[PDB]
Design an enzyme around this catalytic site. Structure first.
Site, PDB file in Angstrom:
ATOM      1  N   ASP A   1       0.823  -1.225   0.000  1.00 17.05           N
ATOM      2  CA  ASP A   1       0.000   0.000   0.000  1.00 17.05           C
ATOM      3  C   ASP A   1       0.848   1.262   0.000  1.00 17.05           C
ATOM      4  O   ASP A   1       0.614   2.091  -0.859  1.00 17.05           O
ATOM      5  CB  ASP A   1      -0.820   0.066   1.285  1.00 17.05           C
ATOM      6  CG  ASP A   1      -1.769  -1.088   1.496  1.00 17.05           C
ATOM      7  OD1 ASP A   1      -1.526  -2.154   0.944  1.00 17.05           O
ATOM      8  OD2 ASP A   1      -2.735  -0.899   2.222  1.00 17.05           O
TER       9      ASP A   1
ATOM     10  N   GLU B   1       0.687  -9.173  11.720  1.00 19.66           N
ATOM     11  CA  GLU B   1       0.588  -8.798  10.322  1.00 19.66           C
ATOM     12  C   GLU B   1       1.987  -8.551   9.775  1.00 19.66           C
ATOM     13  O   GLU B   1       2.306  -8.872   8.631  1.00 19.66           O
ATOM     14  CB  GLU B   1      -0.241  -7.519  10.271  1.00 19.66           C
ATOM     15  CG  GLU B   1      -0.820  -7.236   8.909  1.00 19.66           C
ATOM     16  CD  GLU B   1      -1.711  -6.010   8.838  1.00 19.66           C
ATOM     17  OE1 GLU B   1      -2.301  -5.625   9.890  1.00 19.66           O
ATOM     18  OE2 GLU B   1      -1.809  -5.455   7.723  1.00 19.66           O
TER      19      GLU B   1
HETATM   20  O1  LIG Z   1      -4.424  -8.729   4.170  1.00 19.70           O
HETATM   21  C1  LIG Z   1      -5.355  -7.870   3.576  1.00 19.70           C
HETATM   22  C2  LIG Z   1      -4.662  -6.673   3.101  1.00 19.70           C
HETATM   23  C3  LIG Z   1      -3.511  -7.086   2.096  1.00 19.70           C
HETATM   24  O2  LIG Z   1      -3.977  -7.527   0.824  1.00 19.70           O
HETATM   25  C4  LIG Z   1      -2.628  -5.981   1.781  1.00 19.70           C
HETATM   26  O3  LIG Z   1      -1.469  -6.517   0.981  1.00 19.70           O
HETATM   27  C5  LIG Z   1      -2.097  -5.386   2.925  1.00 19.70           C
HETATM   28  O4  LIG Z   1      -1.227  -4.281   2.467  1.00 19.70           O
HETATM   29  C6  LIG Z   1      -3.202  -4.883   3.814  1.00 19.70           C
HETATM   30  N1  LIG Z   1      -4.014  -5.987   4.273  1.00 19.70           N
HETATM   31  C7  LIG Z   1      -4.743  -5.712   5.232  1.00 19.70           C
HETATM   32  C8  LIG Z   1      -5.852  -4.587   5.074  1.00 19.70           C
HETATM   33  C9  LIG Z   1      -5.634  -3.267   5.555  1.00 19.70           C
HETATM   34  C10 LIG Z   1      -6.577  -2.211   5.386  1.00 19.70           C
HETATM   35  C11 LIG Z   1      -7.788  -2.509   4.764  1.00 19.70           C
HETATM   36  C12 LIG Z   1      -8.850  -1.407   4.617  1.00 19.70           C
HETATM   37  N2  LIG Z   1      -8.890  -0.592   5.856  1.00 19.70           N
HETATM   38  C13 LIG Z   1      -9.717  -0.958   7.024  1.00 19.70           C
HETATM   39  C14 LIG Z   1      -9.850  -0.074   8.101  1.00 19.70           C
HETATM   40  C15 LIG Z   1     -10.637  -0.409   9.226  1.00 19.70           C
HETATM   41  C16 LIG Z   1     -11.285  -1.647   9.269  1.00 19.70           C
HETATM   42  N3  LIG Z   1     -12.106  -2.032  10.418  1.00 19.70           N
HETATM   43  C17 LIG Z   1     -12.679  -3.389  10.551  1.00 19.70           C
HETATM   44  C18 LIG Z   1     -13.117  -3.719  11.984  1.00 19.70           C
HETATM   45  O5  LIG Z   1     -12.634  -2.791  12.907  1.00 19.70           O
HETATM   46  C19 LIG Z   1     -12.964  -1.449  12.655  1.00 19.70           C
HETATM   47  C20 LIG Z   1     -12.916  -1.060  11.168  1.00 19.70           C
HETATM   48  C21 LIG Z   1     -11.136  -2.541   8.193  1.00 19.70           C
HETATM   49  C22 LIG Z   1     -10.351  -2.198   7.072  1.00 19.70           C
HETATM   50  C23 LIG Z   1      -8.056  -3.820   4.301  1.00 19.70           C
HETATM   51  C24 LIG Z   1      -7.089  -4.835   4.458  1.00 19.70           C
END
Ligand SMILES: OC[C@@H]1[C@@H](O)[C@H](O)[C@@H](O)CN1Cc1ccc(CNc2ccc(N3CCOCC3)cc2)cc1
Ligand SMILES: *[C@@H]1O[C@H](CO)[C@@H](O)[C@H](O)[C@H]1NC(C)=O
Length: 765
Positions: A538, A735
């Site tokens: 990201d 992570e």
């Molecule tokens: O592993 C998955 C992904 C990989 O593909 C990538 O490579 C890596 O860089 C990042 N990861 C992880 C990932 C990081 C950010 C997001 C979106 N932001 C976001 C913010 C808050 C919440 N909450 C859920 C419950 O709590 C309160 C709110 C949920 C999501 C989605 C996935």
């Protein structure tokens, strides 16, 4: 015999605890069907339960930890929940019993033990929630003999087209039931198991917490109305005991109250099979599945030195069971922008402002419904399918059950649209949307994601070249079967390949850019000033400002990965016309990787852009990106460039930390900047690729054999120990890991590609 292995697979995997988004629940692989869910919470007061009750997975100081100790989706397993807030150590054993025509039966035991801190006389409310969607389906609570509820078991009788006839029994259980001496007991009973049968419109049945609470509230309202007040109030636990009203409907709430330790069983019996499932069955089948898990682990995940020890065995078992135990079945609509606004073509300077304008138009609509069977990055944070993630999830899963892994691949590839696009994030249904902020819900047909799933295919190909037991490997043991799978999937692989070339194309012909091929150059759509989400990394530093002339060396290397797979599979199918095209393309990428991305100045690969004067400039940021041609197995073993990258990988002043390779070099100016997400921390998926590739080179005659062998040895050691130490201290897989302290940081319960550590330890790639 293909249709035959596929039918047996369907029938094997139909039932599981396929809702990873909640601590414990079950559903089958059918969009609209029968689903179960557990909730529990201590009650100490009149207002406390609403805050104490547990249903959906979270991670905070309240919860010490939780996860699967053993799990196989074909057999079942055991989960441990360590709940501080509620003073409870809970066990959920789940087991499947093959038989009949409806995908077998299953059973679960829920055990709760108060921990040393809890008041020995704690009152804990337990609820088992059951829902059924479908127009022509029925579910009935058989009423009890006693007046106010159940002295013994609750029996639900149900029928549906998908499930035929079945009975689901919530047993009386062992444990003390508190008894109330209040007046209220004349109308509500002194205390006993109670059932409420209800009906709501199908699309809201998933909202167990509100539905329950609505019932609890109506119960309190009743008390107030009938002059039960603070002058002389019933016990809290009696105030939150529902009035018993079994019947028929699409929701059934089964509620118990325990004082002290408790346990009870759920027995689902497909009438399609033989005699109904019993508790004694549950015990036997649980014990037996453990033995089967034991055997299989030692065979499939033989940990090699220096990790032969039992402590590392426990560790590997935890990392593996949590990865595979996260498997879920999801069903519903996605939110997609199908406008194909021209601004998504990203052809201008400043394109990010254009794309934001088109987003501001809000043309996205719900579409589907879709289904996905997949493993997941994080139960509490990310309980849904992520495209490049699953690439990593499936690598250990594949070892364990190749037929399993291919189902999940099949599931993913069936979501592909006519163009060749799969959304990188699969948010299916209102349930799945509930744990995702509105801003992140909308998918965009121009957004790609690494095709890591081809890696898994690669391993299957290499394995294919060289009853629960039989099923798990039927797709390599029956070559006819393997090939047929590839034949059906191959079209979609090729489709997706072409989709990358149509949508993720970099601009050569329009600048001062010479190179061996006019065709080969890639640029991720979707990038913003400080992010490139679609790439997976990201916030890894990229050319500033972002620009239509950018080229991304990670992306080009992924296309490399695809063609190598396409060669292998096309060969196996004899798509000769195809396999020649691929060969010309592979050749060109090999050349173009060098011509367009190699920096002799810096000694590594780099992204590119176009200058203020419109000329091609490399932009070098030494880290994961810089290693991509190597991580993706594109480099000849004797290449001077390979060797130069080995210097970078090993060099402690850049990417080599005691704890693994840093995402970004300590030398780079963006190191430890902004959110510092991919800008210093150690990530296990990218380390895994390095470890695998190092091992490749080490186990071959060549000039870098012995250098590779040494790095392999140390990196394997470093990565595993870092993840292990952290597991030991904290209970969690994390992570990412901190390169200076070795501490795990960001998200917990990331299993999730951290679990890759199981394959790293077992070795012999
Ligand atoms: O592993 C998955 C992904 C990989 O593909 C990538 O490579 C890596 O860089 C990042 N990861 C992880 C990932 C990081 C950010 C997001 C979106 N932001 C976001 C913010 C808050 C919440 N909450 C859920 C419950 O709590 C309160 C709110 C949920 C999501 C989605 C996935
Ligand atoms: C399992 O079988 C049913 C009925 O034969 C069918 O509707 C379904 O497509 C199968 N599930 C899949 C594709 O996983």
């Amino acid at each position: 015999l293909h249709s035959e292995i596929g039918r047996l697979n369907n029938q094997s995997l139909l039932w599981g605890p396929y809702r990873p988004n909640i601590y414990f629940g079950t559903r089958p692989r059918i969009g609209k069907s029968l689903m179960t869910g557990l909730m529990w919470g201590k009650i100490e007061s009149y207002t406390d339960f609403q805050h104490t009750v547990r249903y959906t997975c979270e991670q905070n100081e309240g919860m010490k930890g939780y996860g699967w100790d053993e799990y196989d989706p074909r057999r079942g397993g055991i989960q441990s929940i360590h709940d501080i807030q509620n003073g409870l150590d809970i066990t959920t054993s789940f087991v499947k019993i093959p038989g009949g025509a409806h995908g077998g039966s299953w059973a679960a035991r829920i055990k709760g033990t108060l921990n040393d801190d809890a008041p020995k006389d704690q009152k804990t409310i337990v609820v088992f929630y059951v829902s059924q969607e479908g127009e022509n389906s029925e579910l009935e609570a058989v009423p009890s003999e006693n007046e106010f509820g159940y002295e013994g078991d609750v029996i639900l009788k149900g029928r549906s087209e998908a499930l035929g006839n079945y009975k689901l029994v919530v047993t009386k259980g062992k444990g003390v039931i508190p008894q109330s001496d209040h007046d209220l007991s004349r109308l509500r009973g002194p205390g006993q198991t109670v059932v409420q049968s209800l009906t709501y419109p199908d699309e809201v049945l998933w909202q167990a917490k509100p539905i329950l609470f609505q019932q609890l509230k109506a119960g309190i309202d009743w008390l107030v109305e009938n002059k039960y007040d603070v002058a002389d109030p019933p016990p809290p636990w009696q105030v939150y005991l529902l009035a018993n009203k079994p019947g028929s409907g699409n929701v059934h709430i089964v509620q118990k109250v325990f004082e002290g330790d408790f346990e009870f069983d759920i027995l689902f019996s497909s009438e399609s099979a033989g005699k109904e499932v019993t508790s004694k069955d549950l015990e036997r089948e649980v014990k037996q599945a453990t033995e089967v898990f034991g055997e299989r682990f030692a065979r499939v995940f033989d940990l090699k030195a220096p990790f032969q020890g039992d402590n590392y065995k426990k560790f590997g078992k935890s990392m593996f069971s949590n990865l595979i135990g996260g498997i879920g079945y999801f069903y519903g609509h996605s939110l997609v922008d199908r406008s194909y606004a021209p601004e998504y073509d990203e052809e201008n300077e400043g394109f990010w402002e254009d794309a934001a304008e088109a987003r501001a138009r809000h043309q996205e609509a719900l579409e589907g419904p879709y289904e996905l069977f997949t493993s997941i990055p994080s139960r509490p944070f990310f309980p849904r399918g992520f495209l490049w993630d699953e690439g990593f999830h499936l690598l250990p899963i594949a070892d364990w059950d190749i037929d399993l892994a291919l189902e999940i691949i099949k599931s993913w590839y069936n979501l592909m649209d006519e163009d060749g696009w799969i959304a990188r994030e699969q948010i299916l249904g209102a349930e799945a949307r509930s744990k995702v902020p509105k801003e992140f819900q909308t998918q965009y047909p121009h957004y790609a994601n690494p095709p890591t799933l081809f890696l898994v295919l690669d391993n299957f190909v290499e394995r294919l070249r060289k009853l629960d037991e039989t099923l798990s490997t039927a797709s390599v043991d029956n070559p006819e079967v393997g090939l047929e799978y590839l034949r059906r999937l191959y079209p979609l692989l090729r489709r997706q390949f072409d989709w990358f070339r149509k949508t993720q194309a970099g601009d050569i012909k329009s600048y001062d850019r010479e190179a061996y091929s006019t065709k080969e150059a890639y640029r991720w759509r979707g990038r913003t000033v400080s992010h490139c989400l679609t790439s997976g990394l990201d916030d890894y530093p990229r050319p500033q400002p972002p620009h239509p002339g950018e080229l991304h060396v990670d992306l080009m290397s992924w296309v490399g990965v695809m063609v190598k797979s396409l060669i292998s599979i096309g060969s196996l199918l004899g798509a000769t016309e195809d396999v020649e095209f691929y060969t010309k393309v592979l050749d060109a990428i090999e050349h173009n990787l060098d011509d367009l991305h190699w920096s002799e100045k810096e000694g590594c690969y780099c992204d590119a852009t176009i200058d203020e004067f419109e000329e091609h400039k490399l932009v070098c940021h030494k880290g994961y990106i810089s290693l991509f041609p190597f991580l993706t197995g594109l480099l000849k073993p004797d290449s001077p460039k390979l060797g130069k990258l080995l210097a970078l990988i090993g060099d402690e002043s850049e990417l080599w930390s005691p704890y693994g390779l840093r995402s970004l070099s300590k030398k780079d100016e963006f190191y430890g900047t902004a959110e510092n997400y991919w800008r210093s921390p150690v990530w296990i998926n990218i380390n895994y690729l390095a470890i695998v590739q190092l091992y490749n080179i080490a186990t071959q005659d060549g000039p870098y054999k012995e250098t590779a062998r040494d790095l392999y040895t140390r990196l394997r050691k470093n990565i595993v120990e870092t993840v292990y130490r952290n597991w030991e201290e904290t209970g969690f897989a994390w992570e990412q890991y901190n390169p200076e302290t070795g501490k795990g940081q960001r998200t917990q319960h990331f299993t999730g590609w951290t679990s890759l550590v199981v394959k790293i330890m077992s070795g012999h790639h």
